[PDB]
Write a protein that binds this ligand. Structure first.
Ligand SMILES: CCCCCCSC[C@H](NC(=O)CC[C@H]([NH3+])C(=O)O)C(=O)NCC(=O)O
Ligand SMILES: CCCCCCSC[C@H](NC(=O)CC[C@H]([NH3+])C(=O)O)C(=O)NCC(=O)O
Ligand SMILES: CCCCCCSC[C@H](NC(=O)CC[C@H]([NH3+])C(=O)O)C(=O)NCC(=O)O
Ligand SMILES: CCCCCCCCCCCCCCCC(=O)O
Ligand SMILES: CCCCCCCCCCCCCCCC(=O)O
Ligand SMILES: CCCCCCCCCCCCCCCC(=O)O
Ligand SMILES: CCCCCCCCCCCCCCCC(=O)O
Ligand SMILES: CCCCCCCCCCCCCCCC(=O)O
Ligand SMILES: CCCCCCCCCCCCCCCC(=O)O
Ligand SMILES: CCCCCCCCCCCCCCCC(=O)O
Ligand SMILES: CCCCCCCCCCCCCCCC(=O)O
Ligand SMILES: CCCCCCCCCCCCCCCC(=O)O
Ligand code: NI
Lengths: 145, 145, 145
């Protein structure tokens, strides 16, 4: 059963490593700009970097959720594929944000498309599962007669 | 195997869509009040809305975790049920918070109950799994004699 | 099938309870220091406590992700084990942070080690799955001849 989900599990792990990467970058910025815990404020370089990490942090469970559902109800390989561009896009997102607020927009857009795609796949997959059983029973009630 | 978890998978997806909804509302508020990234501060309308989104964002993995465990160790349908009120409650939470800080309290309470219920189900489910095997072995050691 | 994952499911639940614990501590601090929603700023006691909760909140999906992958591709018991010290460490993290910023460092370190271990297990597990099938096919292409 490990076989049907190993790609999903592996994209999942690369996502964890990437978030961990983002976290260490934040400690790197905290030192570089004299910003010690708590306090999430400082020079805009630091704020831009804290902010990038946080953003990816809240999108991260959305990503995992849809990746798993799309991967299981639609198609594992395609889901893992979207998985990668998403993650790759979030890597470009973080590095862009770090340099400029504007330079973050292109991979944000890239990352959203990928994430929307996952959602669509999950949506389609769930539809195929539930929709035949339902139309069938809609028809049986009206048969009947 | 998709059959035993499709309800859980579908509540999961509706949760993702809802969070996505919250996110777009925040971009909507960022534009409406001249608040550009980084910066999470501004008029209290904006702050109330940023705050609502964030809150739901951190409760979101708690929700998914318990939903899955309750859904698998207790009963899928009931879990998905709690799933819905929770999500429905978090939707009322966000829309209340957006208008007023006080108007957020009623669906927060509603959302907590639902979330507590999931936890209880998960708890009961895990108990049934582990508890017979344990009492049995407690008894065997004392048999013995 | 509940049997192969009940330990993972149970560490998962204890993690949820712990986060819930962190959340109630924050409401406890909000009242204690006159800090009402929104606003995440206040005396450093409050800020230290808000901050602790937030931190654990973003590490929480990393934890769940790796716990599940390590638990399924490497070994369930060991994964659950790391699960506990991690959670136990994050409990010490939160209580330390609450008292002092410096007093948070030791269980942060403890929690990171545990989390790194999970990642390693997940990594090793995924390697064993994918790596034989690959070396085999690398060899077949060069056979051939
Ligand atoms: C998979 C292992 C992950 C890496 C382990 C060590 S990195 C530190 C880890 N992550 C962060 O701090 C990230 C940024 C955090 N949001 C912040 O503002 O400091 C942490 O708990 N920091 C707490 C703190 O210093 O405030
Ligand atoms: C399923 C697809 C989800 C939707 C895709 C596009 S919406 C933007 C997306 N979400 C948010 O910004 C939400 C609020 C965020 N917390 C903030 O402060 O701006 C993002 O990454 N924003 C980054 C930013 O602009 O700061
Ligand atoms: C498993 C059940 C969990 C517990 C239910 C009730 S506790 C309140 C719950 N958690 C928190 O507030 C935690 C801290 C939050 N980050 C904050 O700044 O207030 C919430 O939604 N608070 C919203 C708010 O008051 O701002
Ligand atoms: C279509 C197949 C996609 C493969 C994704 C594998 C990702 C490996 C990440 C480490
Ligand atoms: C049997 C009831 C199932 C209700 C869920 C419908 C899923 C729609 C997913 C889009
Ligand atoms: C699986 C059984 C299929 C039931 C027939 C439903 C027909 C409507 C769907 C197109
Ligand atoms: C008891 C059954 C609960 C059904 C939940 C289905 C939710 C559909 C969300 C799209
Ligand atoms: C075999 C050891 C299992 C230990 C976990 C106990 C679960 C309690 C859940 C409430
Ligand atoms: C499954 C086997 C049941 C073992 C008997 C344990 C009795 C105590 C639980 C009530
Ligand atoms: C090696 C076995 C580890 C057991 C972890 C069980 C945790 C119970 C938490 C409630
Ligand atoms: C078949 C393609 C699989 C690609 C994923 C490789 C996993 C590496 C995990 C470390
Ligand atoms: C499962 C089949 C094993 C294929 C042989 C691959 C040999 C290289 C791995 C050591
Ligand atoms: Ni099976």
């Amino acid at each position: 059963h490990k076989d049907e989900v190993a790609l999903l599990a592996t994209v999942t792990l690369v996502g964890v490593l990437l978030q961990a990467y983002f976290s260490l970058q934040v400690i790197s910025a905290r030192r570089a700009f004299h910003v010690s815990p708590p306090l999430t404020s400082g020079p805009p370089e630091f704020e831009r970097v804290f902010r990038a990490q946080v953003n990816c942090s809240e999108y991260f469970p959305l990503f995992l959720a849809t990746l798993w559902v799309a991967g299981i109800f639609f198609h594992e390989g395609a889901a893992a594929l979207c998985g990668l561009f998403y993650l790759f896009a979030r890597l470009r997102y973080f590095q862009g944000y770090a340099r400029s607020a504007q330079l973050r927009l292109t991979p944000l857009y890239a990352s959203a498309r990928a994430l929307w795609l996952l959602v669509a796949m999950a949506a389609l997959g769930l539809l195929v599962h539930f929709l035949p059983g339902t139309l069938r029973t809609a028809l049986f009630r009206w048969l009947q007669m």
